[PDB]
PDB file of C-alpha atoms in Angstrom:
ATOM      1  CA  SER A   1     -51.596   5.578  16.350  1.00  0.00           C
ATOM      2  CA  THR A   2     -50.880   6.436  19.972  1.00  0.00           C
ATOM      3  CA  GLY A   3     -49.481   4.775  23.080  1.00  0.00           C
ATOM      4  CA  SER A   4     -49.932   5.449  26.789  1.00  0.00           C
ATOM      5  CA  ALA A   5     -47.982   3.734  29.541  1.00  0.00           C
ATOM      6  CA  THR A   6     -47.725   4.267  33.260  1.00  0.00           C
ATOM      7  CA  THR A   7     -44.285   4.970  34.647  1.00  0.00           C
ATOM      8  CA  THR A   8     -43.553   4.113  38.271  1.00  0.00           C
ATOM      9  CA  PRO A   9     -40.808   5.235  40.648  1.00  0.00           C
ATOM     10  CA  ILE A  10     -38.410   2.384  41.493  1.00  0.00           C
ATOM     11  CA  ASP A  11     -38.130   3.403  45.126  1.00  0.00           C
ATOM     12  CA  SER A  12     -39.342   5.833  47.762  1.00  0.00           C
ATOM     13  CA  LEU A  13     -36.948   8.532  46.571  1.00  0.00           C
ATOM     14  CA  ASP A  14     -37.958   8.565  42.889  1.00  0.00           C
ATOM     15  CA  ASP A  15     -34.373   7.576  42.001  1.00  0.00           C
ATOM     16  CA  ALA A  16     -35.681   6.483  38.618  1.00  0.00           C
ATOM     17  CA  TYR A  17     -38.866   5.431  36.884  1.00  0.00           C
ATOM     18  CA  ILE A  18     -39.730   2.175  35.163  1.00  0.00           C
ATOM     19  CA  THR A  19     -42.227   1.694  32.389  1.00  0.00           C
ATOM     20  CA  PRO A  20     -43.422  -1.744  31.198  1.00  0.00           C
ATOM     21  CA  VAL A  21     -42.411  -2.594  27.628  1.00  0.00           C
ATOM     22  CA  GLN A  22     -43.556  -5.608  25.611  1.00  0.00           C
ATOM     23  CA  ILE A  23     -40.783  -7.210  23.561  1.00  0.00           C
ATOM     24  CA  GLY A  24     -41.134 -10.124  21.210  1.00  0.00           C
ATOM     25  CA  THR A  25     -43.729 -12.712  20.339  1.00  0.00           C
ATOM     26  CA  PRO A  26     -45.185 -13.861  22.637  1.00  0.00           C
ATOM     27  CA  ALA A  27     -44.681 -10.659  24.586  1.00  0.00           C
ATOM     28  CA  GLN A  28     -41.905 -10.564  27.125  1.00  0.00           C
ATOM     29  CA  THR A  29     -42.620  -7.661  29.437  1.00  0.00           C
ATOM     30  CA  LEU A  30     -39.592  -5.833  30.804  1.00  0.00           C
ATOM     31  CA  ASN A  31     -39.604  -2.740  32.988  1.00  0.00           C
ATOM     32  CA  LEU A  32     -37.418  -0.186  31.273  1.00  0.00           C
ATOM     33  CA  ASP A  33     -35.961   3.161  32.249  1.00  0.00           C
ATOM     34  CA  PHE A  34     -37.201   5.637  29.648  1.00  0.00           C
ATOM     35  CA  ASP A  35     -34.243   7.921  29.091  1.00  0.00           C
ATOM     36  CA  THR A  36     -34.522  11.113  27.051  1.00  0.00           C
ATOM     37  CA  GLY A  37     -30.749  11.510  27.565  1.00  0.00           C
ATOM     38  CA  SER A  38     -29.660   8.437  25.571  1.00  0.00           C
ATOM     39  CA  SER A  39     -30.694   6.641  22.429  1.00  0.00           C
ATOM     40  CA  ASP A  40     -30.214   2.914  22.969  1.00  0.00           C
ATOM     41  CA  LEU A  41     -32.940   0.455  23.841  1.00  0.00           C
ATOM     42  CA  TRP A  42     -31.061  -2.212  25.740  1.00  0.00           C
ATOM     43  CA  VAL A  43     -32.171  -5.065  27.959  1.00  0.00           C
ATOM     44  CA  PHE A  44     -30.961  -7.624  30.402  1.00  0.00           C
ATOM     45  CA  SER A  45     -31.129 -10.857  28.475  1.00  0.00           C
ATOM     46  CA  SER A  46     -30.444 -14.551  28.327  1.00  0.00           C
ATOM     47  CA  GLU A  47     -27.033 -13.485  27.014  1.00  0.00           C
ATOM     48  CA  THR A  48     -26.126 -11.358  30.022  1.00  0.00           C
ATOM     49  CA  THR A  49     -23.226 -12.700  32.085  1.00  0.00           C
ATOM     50  CA  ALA A  50     -24.989 -14.734  34.788  1.00  0.00           C
ATOM     51  CA  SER A  51     -23.047 -13.203  37.707  1.00  0.00           C
ATOM     52  CA  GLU A  52     -24.186  -9.777  36.485  1.00  0.00           C
ATOM     53  CA  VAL A  53     -27.883 -10.622  36.680  1.00  0.00           C
ATOM     54  CA  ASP A  54     -29.450 -10.201  40.125  1.00  0.00           C
ATOM     55  CA  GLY A  55     -33.229 -10.176  40.031  1.00  0.00           C
ATOM     56  CA  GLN A  56     -33.861  -8.473  36.720  1.00  0.00           C
ATOM     57  CA  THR A  57     -36.328  -9.809  34.200  1.00  0.00           C
ATOM     58  CA  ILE A  58     -34.476 -10.937  31.083  1.00  0.00           C
ATOM     59  CA  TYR A  59     -35.307 -10.867  27.393  1.00  0.00           C
ATOM     60  CA  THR A  60     -34.771 -14.285  25.821  1.00  0.00           C
ATOM     61  CA  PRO A  61     -34.715 -13.758  22.051  1.00  0.00           C
ATOM     62  CA  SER A  62     -34.670 -17.486  21.282  1.00  0.00           C
ATOM     63  CA  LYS A  63     -38.191 -17.629  22.775  1.00  0.00           C
ATOM     64  CA  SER A  64     -39.421 -14.858  20.456  1.00  0.00           C
ATOM     65  CA  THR A  65     -40.689 -15.932  17.069  1.00  0.00           C
ATOM     66  CA  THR A  66     -40.200 -12.400  15.736  1.00  0.00           C
ATOM     67  CA  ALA A  67     -36.632 -11.904  17.022  1.00  0.00           C
ATOM     68  CA  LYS A  68     -33.909 -11.727  14.412  1.00  0.00           C
ATOM     69  CA  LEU A  69     -30.222 -11.349  15.116  1.00  0.00           C
ATOM     70  CA  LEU A  70     -28.907  -8.186  13.553  1.00  0.00           C
ATOM     71  CA  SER A  71     -25.850  -9.728  11.981  1.00  0.00           C
ATOM     72  CA  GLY A  72     -22.547  -8.239  13.026  1.00  0.00           C
ATOM     73  CA  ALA A  73     -24.080  -5.503  15.182  1.00  0.00           C
ATOM     74  CA  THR A  74     -22.709  -4.671  18.621  1.00  0.00           C
ATOM     75  CA  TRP A  75     -23.280  -1.895  21.080  1.00  0.00           C
ATOM     76  CA  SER A  76     -21.485  -0.376  24.001  1.00  0.00           C
ATOM     77  CA  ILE A  77     -22.531   2.592  26.064  1.00  0.00           C
ATOM     78  CA  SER A  78     -21.281   4.605  29.031  1.00  0.00           C
ATOM     79  CA  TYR A  79     -23.542   6.937  30.979  1.00  0.00           C
ATOM     80  CA  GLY A  80     -22.882  10.237  32.710  1.00  0.00           C
ATOM     81  CA  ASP A  81     -22.971   8.476  36.072  1.00  0.00           C
ATOM     82  CA  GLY A  82     -20.141   6.117  35.104  1.00  0.00           C
ATOM     83  CA  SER A  83     -22.268   3.048  34.478  1.00  0.00           C
ATOM     84  CA  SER A  84     -21.969   1.040  31.265  1.00  0.00           C
ATOM     85  CA  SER A  85     -23.250  -1.939  29.325  1.00  0.00           C
ATOM     86  CA  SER A  86     -22.635  -3.673  26.014  1.00  0.00           C
ATOM     87  CA  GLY A  87     -23.671  -6.589  23.850  1.00  0.00           C
ATOM     88  CA  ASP A  88     -25.228  -7.598  20.546  1.00  0.00           C
ATOM     89  CA  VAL A  89     -28.435  -6.684  18.785  1.00  0.00           C
ATOM     90  CA  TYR A  90     -31.717  -8.198  17.717  1.00  0.00           C
ATOM     91  CA  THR A  91     -34.618  -6.691  15.896  1.00  0.00           C
ATOM     92  CA  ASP A  92     -37.996  -7.519  17.360  1.00  0.00           C
ATOM     93  CA  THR A  93     -41.471  -6.204  17.959  1.00  0.00           C
ATOM     94  CA  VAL A  94     -41.631  -3.692  20.765  1.00  0.00           C
ATOM     95  CA  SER A  95     -44.841  -2.255  22.182  1.00  0.00           C
ATOM     96  CA  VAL A  96     -45.283   0.563  24.677  1.00  0.00           C
ATOM     97  CA  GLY A  97     -48.712   1.267  26.094  1.00  0.00           C
ATOM     98  CA  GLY A  98     -50.478  -0.161  23.026  1.00  0.00           C
ATOM     99  CA  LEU A  99     -48.104   1.394  20.497  1.00  0.00           C
ATOM    100  CA  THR A 100     -46.211  -1.156  18.434  1.00  0.00           C
ATOM    101  CA  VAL A 101     -42.998  -0.910  16.437  1.00  0.00           C
ATOM    102  CA  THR A 102     -41.883  -3.834  14.325  1.00  0.00           C
ATOM    103  CA  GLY A 103     -38.173  -4.272  13.588  1.00  0.00           C
ATOM    104  CA  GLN A 104     -37.044  -2.267  16.597  1.00  0.00           C
ATOM    105  CA  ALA A 105     -33.391  -2.734  17.498  1.00  0.00           C
ATOM    106  CA  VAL A 106     -33.365  -4.455  20.874  1.00  0.00           C
ATOM    107  CA  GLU A 107     -29.858  -4.296  22.239  1.00  0.00           C
ATOM    108  CA  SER A 108     -29.100  -7.431  24.218  1.00  0.00           C
ATOM    109  CA  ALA A 109     -26.662  -6.985  27.093  1.00  0.00           C
ATOM    110  CA  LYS A 110     -23.769  -9.397  27.342  1.00  0.00           C
ATOM    111  CA  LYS A 111     -22.119  -7.243  30.020  1.00  0.00           C
ATOM    112  CA  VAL A 112     -23.481  -4.676  32.457  1.00  0.00           C
ATOM    113  CA  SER A 113     -21.687  -2.666  35.136  1.00  0.00           C
ATOM    114  CA  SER A 114     -22.267  -3.211  38.817  1.00  0.00           C
ATOM    115  CA  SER A 115     -24.798  -0.400  39.325  1.00  0.00           C
ATOM    116  CA  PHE A 116     -27.139  -2.040  36.831  1.00  0.00           C
ATOM    117  CA  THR A 117     -26.652  -5.476  38.404  1.00  0.00           C
ATOM    118  CA  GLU A 118     -27.319  -3.985  41.847  1.00  0.00           C
ATOM    119  CA  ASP A 119     -30.581  -2.436  40.707  1.00  0.00           C
ATOM    120  CA  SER A 120     -32.999  -5.348  40.436  1.00  0.00           C
ATOM    121  CA  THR A 121     -35.908  -3.087  39.436  1.00  0.00           C
ATOM    122  CA  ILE A 122     -34.521  -1.888  36.093  1.00  0.00           C
ATOM    123  CA  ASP A 123     -34.493  -4.452  33.274  1.00  0.00           C
ATOM    124  CA  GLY A 124     -32.924  -2.072  30.765  1.00  0.00           C
ATOM    125  CA  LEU A 125     -33.167   1.378  29.188  1.00  0.00           C
ATOM    126  CA  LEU A 126     -35.332   2.773  26.401  1.00  0.00           C
ATOM    127  CA  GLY A 127     -33.566   5.742  24.879  1.00  0.00           C
ATOM    128  CA  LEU A 128     -35.584   8.728  23.703  1.00  0.00           C
ATOM    129  CA  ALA A 129     -32.840  11.213  22.770  1.00  0.00           C
ATOM    130  CA  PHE A 130     -31.982  11.656  19.104  1.00  0.00           C
ATOM    131  CA  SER A 131     -30.942   8.607  17.124  1.00  0.00           C
ATOM    132  CA  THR A 132     -27.632  10.260  16.288  1.00  0.00           C
ATOM    133  CA  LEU A 133     -26.437   9.128  19.755  1.00  0.00           C
ATOM    134  CA  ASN A 134     -27.305   5.465  19.222  1.00  0.00           C
ATOM    135  CA  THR A 135     -24.214   3.337  19.850  1.00  0.00           C
ATOM    136  CA  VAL A 136     -24.960   0.392  17.575  1.00  0.00           C
ATOM    137  CA  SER A 137     -22.077  -0.436  15.259  1.00  0.00           C
ATOM    138  CA  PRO A 138     -21.413  -0.677  12.388  1.00  0.00           C
ATOM    139  CA  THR A 139     -24.963   0.405  11.492  1.00  0.00           C
ATOM    140  CA  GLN A 140     -26.512   2.946  13.828  1.00  0.00           C
ATOM    141  CA  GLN A 141     -30.081   2.132  14.846  1.00  0.00           C
ATOM    142  CA  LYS A 142     -33.163   4.275  15.415  1.00  0.00           C
ATOM    143  CA  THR A 143     -34.890   4.886  18.739  1.00  0.00           C
ATOM    144  CA  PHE A 144     -38.336   3.534  19.443  1.00  0.00           C
ATOM    145  CA  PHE A 145     -39.776   7.049  19.051  1.00  0.00           C
ATOM    146  CA  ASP A 146     -37.969   7.604  15.784  1.00  0.00           C
ATOM    147  CA  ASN A 147     -39.347   4.329  14.421  1.00  0.00           C
ATOM    148  CA  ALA A 148     -42.877   5.119  15.637  1.00  0.00           C
ATOM    149  CA  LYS A 149     -42.955   8.775  14.586  1.00  0.00           C
ATOM    150  CA  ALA A 150     -44.446   8.547  11.147  1.00  0.00           C
ATOM    151  CA  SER A 151     -47.287   6.344  12.451  1.00  0.00           C
ATOM    152  CA  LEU A 152     -48.145   8.573  15.377  1.00  0.00           C
ATOM    153  CA  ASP A 153     -51.171  10.874  15.232  1.00  0.00           C
ATOM    154  CA  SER A 154     -48.732  13.650  16.141  1.00  0.00           C
ATOM    155  CA  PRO A 155     -44.934  13.281  16.184  1.00  0.00           C
ATOM    156  CA  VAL A 156     -44.621  13.807  19.928  1.00  0.00           C
ATOM    157  CA  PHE A 157     -44.220  12.059  23.202  1.00  0.00           C
ATOM    158  CA  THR A 158     -44.914  13.498  26.638  1.00  0.00           C
ATOM    159  CA  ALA A 159     -43.392  12.842  30.041  1.00  0.00           C
ATOM    160  CA  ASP A 160     -45.598  13.256  33.087  1.00  0.00           C
ATOM    161  CA  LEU A 161     -43.495  12.009  35.980  1.00  0.00           C
ATOM    162  CA  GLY A 162     -45.025  11.752  39.413  1.00  0.00           C
ATOM    163  CA  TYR A 163     -43.624  12.879  42.748  1.00  0.00           C
ATOM    164  CA  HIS A 164     -43.556   9.776  44.933  1.00  0.00           C
ATOM    165  CA  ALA A 165     -46.273   8.475  42.644  1.00  0.00           C
ATOM    166  CA  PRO A 166     -46.896   6.922  39.246  1.00  0.00           C
ATOM    167  CA  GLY A 167     -47.012   9.029  36.119  1.00  0.00           C
ATOM    168  CA  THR A 168     -47.415   8.606  32.402  1.00  0.00           C
ATOM    169  CA  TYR A 169     -45.524   8.494  29.121  1.00  0.00           C
ATOM    170  CA  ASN A 170     -47.736   9.203  26.122  1.00  0.00           C
ATOM    171  CA  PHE A 171     -46.808   8.784  22.482  1.00  0.00           C
ATOM    172  CA  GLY A 172     -48.560  10.507  19.642  1.00  0.00           C
ATOM    173  CA  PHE A 173     -50.881  12.865  21.525  1.00  0.00           C
ATOM    174  CA  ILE A 174     -51.070  15.546  24.170  1.00  0.00           C
ATOM    175  CA  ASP A 175     -53.451  14.810  27.019  1.00  0.00           C
ATOM    176  CA  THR A 176     -54.977  18.224  27.596  1.00  0.00           C
ATOM    177  CA  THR A 177     -56.407  17.015  30.938  1.00  0.00           C
ATOM    178  CA  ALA A 178     -52.915  16.277  32.314  1.00  0.00           C
ATOM    179  CA  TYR A 179     -51.762  19.846  32.878  1.00  0.00           C
ATOM    180  CA  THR A 180     -52.952  23.244  33.996  1.00  0.00           C
ATOM    181  CA  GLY A 181     -52.753  26.493  32.068  1.00  0.00           C
ATOM    182  CA  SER A 182     -50.865  26.387  28.777  1.00  0.00           C
ATOM    183  CA  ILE A 183     -47.887  24.571  27.376  1.00  0.00           C
ATOM    184  CA  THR A 184     -44.982  26.911  26.716  1.00  0.00           C
ATOM    185  CA  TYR A 185     -42.773  25.750  23.899  1.00  0.00           C
ATOM    186  CA  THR A 186     -39.108  26.552  23.661  1.00  0.00           C
ATOM    187  CA  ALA A 187     -36.391  25.961  21.066  1.00  0.00           C
ATOM    188  CA  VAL A 188     -34.296  22.802  20.990  1.00  0.00           C
ATOM    189  CA  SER A 189     -30.784  22.224  19.726  1.00  0.00           C
ATOM    190  CA  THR A 190     -30.179  18.690  18.502  1.00  0.00           C
ATOM    191  CA  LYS A 191     -26.473  19.432  17.859  1.00  0.00           C
ATOM    192  CA  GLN A 192     -25.308  17.204  20.742  1.00  0.00           C
ATOM    193  CA  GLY A 193     -28.063  14.626  20.194  1.00  0.00           C
ATOM    194  CA  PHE A 194     -29.990  15.748  23.276  1.00  0.00           C
ATOM    195  CA  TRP A 195     -33.251  17.543  23.973  1.00  0.00           C
ATOM    196  CA  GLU A 196     -31.168  20.637  24.625  1.00  0.00           C
ATOM    197  CA  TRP A 197     -32.845  23.927  25.444  1.00  0.00           C
ATOM    198  CA  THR A 198     -32.270  27.223  27.231  1.00  0.00           C
ATOM    199  CA  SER A 199     -34.034  28.050  30.449  1.00  0.00           C
ATOM    200  CA  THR A 200     -34.681  31.730  30.919  1.00  0.00           C
ATOM    201  CA  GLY A 201     -33.677  31.831  34.571  1.00  0.00           C
ATOM    202  CA  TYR A 202     -34.572  30.877  38.096  1.00  0.00           C
ATOM    203  CA  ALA A 203     -35.901  31.808  41.503  1.00  0.00           C
ATOM    204  CA  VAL A 204     -35.239  30.371  44.947  1.00  0.00           C
ATOM    205  CA  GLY A 205     -38.267  30.041  47.189  1.00  0.00           C
ATOM    206  CA  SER A 206     -40.233  33.281  47.219  1.00  0.00           C
ATOM    207  CA  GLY A 207     -37.242  35.228  45.928  1.00  0.00           C
ATOM    208  CA  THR A 208     -37.081  37.400  42.842  1.00  0.00           C
ATOM    209  CA  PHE A 209     -36.667  35.762  39.480  1.00  0.00           C
ATOM    210  CA  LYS A 210     -33.167  36.013  38.053  1.00  0.00           C
ATOM    211  CA  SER A 211     -33.242  36.356  34.279  1.00  0.00           C
ATOM    212  CA  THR A 212     -30.311  34.397  32.933  1.00  0.00           C
ATOM    213  CA  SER A 213     -29.817  31.861  30.157  1.00  0.00           C
ATOM    214  CA  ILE A 214     -29.199  28.307  31.313  1.00  0.00           C
ATOM    215  CA  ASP A 215     -28.473  25.826  28.522  1.00  0.00           C
ATOM    216  CA  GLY A 216     -29.297  22.270  29.525  1.00  0.00           C
ATOM    217  CA  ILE A 217     -30.894  18.995  28.535  1.00  0.00           C
ATOM    218  CA  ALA A 218     -34.284  17.572  29.440  1.00  0.00           C
ATOM    219  CA  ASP A 219     -33.184  14.186  30.733  1.00  0.00           C
ATOM    220  CA  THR A 220     -35.676  11.724  32.200  1.00  0.00           C
ATOM    221  CA  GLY A 221     -32.829   9.281  32.862  1.00  0.00           C
ATOM    222  CA  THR A 222     -31.071  11.538  35.354  1.00  0.00           C
ATOM    223  CA  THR A 223     -32.483  11.701  38.856  1.00  0.00           C
ATOM    224  CA  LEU A 224     -31.420  15.139  39.963  1.00  0.00           C
ATOM    225  CA  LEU A 225     -31.278  18.718  38.744  1.00  0.00           C
ATOM    226  CA  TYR A 226     -27.744  19.746  37.768  1.00  0.00           C
ATOM    227  CA  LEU A 227     -27.194  23.470  37.325  1.00  0.00           C
ATOM    228  CA  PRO A 228     -24.337  26.003  37.354  1.00  0.00           C
ATOM    229  CA  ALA A 229     -22.464  26.308  40.644  1.00  0.00           C
ATOM    230  CA  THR A 230     -23.618  29.921  41.068  1.00  0.00           C
ATOM    231  CA  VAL A 231     -27.273  28.905  40.863  1.00  0.00           C
ATOM    232  CA  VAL A 232     -26.866  25.905  43.125  1.00  0.00           C
ATOM    233  CA  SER A 233     -24.963  27.953  45.707  1.00  0.00           C
ATOM    234  CA  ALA A 234     -27.758  30.516  45.687  1.00  0.00           C
ATOM    235  CA  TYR A 235     -30.293  27.757  46.337  1.00  0.00           C
ATOM    236  CA  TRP A 236     -28.514  26.000  49.207  1.00  0.00           C
ATOM    237  CA  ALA A 237     -27.604  29.312  50.872  1.00  0.00           C
ATOM    238  CA  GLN A 238     -31.301  29.478  51.766  1.00  0.00           C
ATOM    239  CA  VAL A 239     -31.132  26.208  53.726  1.00  0.00           C
ATOM    240  CA  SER A 240     -29.656  26.507  57.179  1.00  0.00           C
ATOM    241  CA  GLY A 241     -26.766  24.119  57.644  1.00  0.00           C
ATOM    242  CA  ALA A 242     -26.516  23.097  53.992  1.00  0.00           C
ATOM    243  CA  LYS A 243     -23.033  22.598  52.630  1.00  0.00           C
ATOM    244  CA  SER A 244     -21.217  21.071  49.705  1.00  0.00           C
ATOM    245  CA  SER A 245     -19.436  17.937  50.883  1.00  0.00           C
ATOM    246  CA  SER A 246     -16.733  16.491  48.623  1.00  0.00           C
ATOM    247  CA  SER A 247     -16.730  13.296  50.705  1.00  0.00           C
ATOM    248  CA  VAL A 248     -20.425  12.723  50.072  1.00  0.00           C
ATOM    249  CA  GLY A 249     -20.206  14.135  46.539  1.00  0.00           C
ATOM    250  CA  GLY A 250     -22.479  17.143  46.611  1.00  0.00           C
ATOM    251  CA  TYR A 251     -24.700  19.393  48.660  1.00  0.00           C
ATOM    252  CA  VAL A 252     -26.060  17.907  51.838  1.00  0.00           C
ATOM    253  CA  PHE A 253     -28.461  19.487  54.274  1.00  0.00           C
ATOM    254  CA  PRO A 254     -29.900  18.770  57.694  1.00  0.00           C
ATOM    255  CA  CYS A 255     -32.748  16.297  57.363  1.00  0.00           C
ATOM    256  CA  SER A 256     -34.687  18.555  59.783  1.00  0.00           C
ATOM    257  CA  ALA A 257     -34.728  21.402  57.252  1.00  0.00           C
ATOM    258  CA  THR A 258     -37.710  22.648  55.336  1.00  0.00           C
ATOM    259  CA  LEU A 259     -36.532  23.108  51.770  1.00  0.00           C
ATOM    260  CA  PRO A 260     -37.460  26.131  49.669  1.00  0.00           C
ATOM    261  CA  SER A 261     -38.976  25.692  46.240  1.00  0.00           C
ATOM    262  CA  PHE A 262     -36.985  26.259  43.075  1.00  0.00           C
ATOM    263  CA  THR A 263     -38.454  27.915  40.028  1.00  0.00           C
ATOM    264  CA  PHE A 264     -37.066  27.671  36.501  1.00  0.00           C
ATOM    265  CA  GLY A 265     -38.037  29.690  33.454  1.00  0.00           C
ATOM    266  CA  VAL A 266     -39.440  28.383  30.242  1.00  0.00           C
ATOM    267  CA  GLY A 267     -39.656  31.464  28.070  1.00  0.00           C
ATOM    268  CA  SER A 268     -41.948  33.798  29.980  1.00  0.00           C
ATOM    269  CA  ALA A 269     -43.474  30.873  31.911  1.00  0.00           C
ATOM    270  CA  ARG A 270     -42.370  29.469  35.252  1.00  0.00           C
ATOM    271  CA  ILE A 271     -42.168  25.911  36.567  1.00  0.00           C
ATOM    272  CA  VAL A 272     -42.093  25.615  40.353  1.00  0.00           C
ATOM    273  CA  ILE A 273     -40.312  22.666  41.924  1.00  0.00           C
ATOM    274  CA  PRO A 274     -41.657  22.241  45.460  1.00  0.00           C
ATOM    275  CA  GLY A 275     -39.010  22.009  48.136  1.00  0.00           C
ATOM    276  CA  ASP A 276     -40.046  18.446  49.029  1.00  0.00           C
ATOM    277  CA  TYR A 277     -38.994  17.364  45.521  1.00  0.00           C
ATOM    278  CA  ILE A 278     -35.424  18.381  46.345  1.00  0.00           C
ATOM    279  CA  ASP A 279     -35.062  16.043  49.372  1.00  0.00           C
ATOM    280  CA  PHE A 280     -33.339  12.736  48.546  1.00  0.00           C
ATOM    281  CA  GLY A 281     -33.132  11.564  52.094  1.00  0.00           C
ATOM    282  CA  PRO A 282     -30.356  10.437  54.400  1.00  0.00           C
ATOM    283  CA  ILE A 283     -26.910  10.103  52.817  1.00  0.00           C
ATOM    284  CA  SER A 284     -26.646   6.755  54.571  1.00  0.00           C
ATOM    285  CA  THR A 285     -29.199   4.736  56.491  1.00  0.00           C
ATOM    286  CA  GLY A 286     -29.958   6.387  59.800  1.00  0.00           C
ATOM    287  CA  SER A 287     -28.061   9.581  59.034  1.00  0.00           C
ATOM    288  CA  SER A 288     -29.505  13.012  59.827  1.00  0.00           C
ATOM    289  CA  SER A 289     -27.648  14.482  56.876  1.00  0.00           C
ATOM    290  CA  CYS A 290     -29.796  14.438  53.737  1.00  0.00           C
ATOM    291  CA  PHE A 291     -28.761  14.548  50.099  1.00  0.00           C
ATOM    292  CA  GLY A 292     -29.863  17.487  48.013  1.00  0.00           C
ATOM    293  CA  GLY A 293     -31.763  17.155  44.764  1.00  0.00           C
ATOM    294  CA  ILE A 294     -30.183  20.220  43.182  1.00  0.00           C
ATOM    295  CA  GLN A 295     -26.507  19.768  42.523  1.00  0.00           C
ATOM    296  CA  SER A 296     -23.712  21.501  40.641  1.00  0.00           C
ATOM    297  CA  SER A 297     -23.136  20.651  36.983  1.00  0.00           C
ATOM    298  CA  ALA A 298     -19.559  21.906  37.228  1.00  0.00           C
ATOM    299  CA  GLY A 299     -17.367  19.163  35.825  1.00  0.00           C
ATOM    300  CA  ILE A 300     -20.285  17.408  34.105  1.00  0.00           C
ATOM    301  CA  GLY A 301     -19.909  19.811  31.221  1.00  0.00           C
ATOM    302  CA  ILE A 302     -23.630  20.290  30.730  1.00  0.00           C
ATOM    303  CA  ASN A 303     -26.628  21.345  32.803  1.00  0.00           C
ATOM    304  CA  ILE A 304     -29.213  18.618  33.307  1.00  0.00           C
ATOM    305  CA  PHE A 305     -32.912  19.127  33.863  1.00  0.00           C
ATOM    306  CA  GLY A 306     -33.385  15.717  35.372  1.00  0.00           C
ATOM    307  CA  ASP A 307     -36.368  14.136  37.086  1.00  0.00           C
ATOM    308  CA  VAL A 308     -36.344  16.647  39.950  1.00  0.00           C
ATOM    309  CA  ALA A 309     -37.183  19.351  37.438  1.00  0.00           C
ATOM    310  CA  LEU A 310     -39.199  17.367  34.934  1.00  0.00           C
ATOM    311  CA  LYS A 311     -41.552  15.835  37.495  1.00  0.00           C
ATOM    312  CA  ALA A 312     -42.782  19.325  38.387  1.00  0.00           C
ATOM    313  CA  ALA A 313     -44.053  19.688  34.811  1.00  0.00           C
ATOM    314  CA  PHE A 314     -45.950  18.153  31.975  1.00  0.00           C
ATOM    315  CA  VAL A 315     -43.248  17.945  29.325  1.00  0.00           C
ATOM    316  CA  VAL A 316     -43.787  17.699  25.580  1.00  0.00           C
ATOM    317  CA  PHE A 317     -41.005  16.272  23.478  1.00  0.00           C
ATOM    318  CA  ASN A 318     -42.022  17.547  20.066  1.00  0.00           C
ATOM    319  CA  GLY A 319     -40.296  15.514  17.361  1.00  0.00           C
ATOM    320  CA  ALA A 320     -41.540  17.565  14.442  1.00  0.00           C
ATOM    321  CA  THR A 321     -39.118  18.425  11.635  1.00  0.00           C
ATOM    322  CA  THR A 322     -37.868  21.186  13.883  1.00  0.00           C
ATOM    323  CA  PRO A 323     -38.023  19.679  17.357  1.00  0.00           C
ATOM    324  CA  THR A 324     -39.138  21.770  20.332  1.00  0.00           C
ATOM    325  CA  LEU A 325     -39.821  21.213  24.025  1.00  0.00           C
ATOM    326  CA  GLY A 326     -43.017  22.173  25.800  1.00  0.00           C
ATOM    327  CA  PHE A 327     -43.524  22.658  29.531  1.00  0.00           C
ATOM    328  CA  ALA A 328     -46.741  23.105  31.445  1.00  0.00           C
ATOM    329  CA  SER A 329     -47.522  23.246  35.126  1.00  0.00           C
ATOM    330  CA  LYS A 330     -49.734  20.481  36.450  1.00  0.00           C
TER     331      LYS A 330
END
């Protein structure tokens, strides 16, 4: 089997991407944030505290003839950005782009933090990191990909995120028309439950490539590119007027600037992030100070190849016995 679903930016800045997911019988379609940095599929639901729902589409398991309460199961998760959610668990039929999993754990939110409430466009998350990170207790549950794997034509899914435009998540096949040149595959460590890999270095604009190992995670659920302070300093030094602002919470730059590109290494290959991808617009409405899309990972504890990086590539998440990551230009 295979699946193919379009993923759409939630706003003009590509702050995140939503992908329609069918849950239950009859289908209830929710727009979920596919997140290769976490491993819970959770949804706004009929059980979510009413004051914490503000425009989201909810899953109502009582209206699904295939929903079954997973007795005794609860979940609770906190994300790198400080947001959190928690609740109980159903199993139900979940389909993504024509690909169907029966008995998928659908984690029903009883509580969500304010940032989820305040984002009316995201109805929940669909985790695509390794199932070892799944928070369901007392019986850990498998991700949608993990459940689908054995049925897939090939045990892979691919992320093809658009810049200010829709893109695609595919399951079970590699669309050879979706990228240019070749896919370069690189080793993954699953030791922390992430799609963790080692970039071979970087360049800023038309500058020389610096060969240096950068361990980080391919994370579709993180907006920006978080890299070591040395790297990030080298980037923003090439933008006149750019500075790190503790009050704003990162590097800012004059909105009048033209941003240089940023290149990262995948083995001997090179992915080029155009400078426009690195502009996340005014820090506040009407401001001429703009927020940068490359930020320091210092104090995160891990480097994150978030959407800013991933959207410049066709990315293969190879879930073979020994997982690997593939990157192609597009």
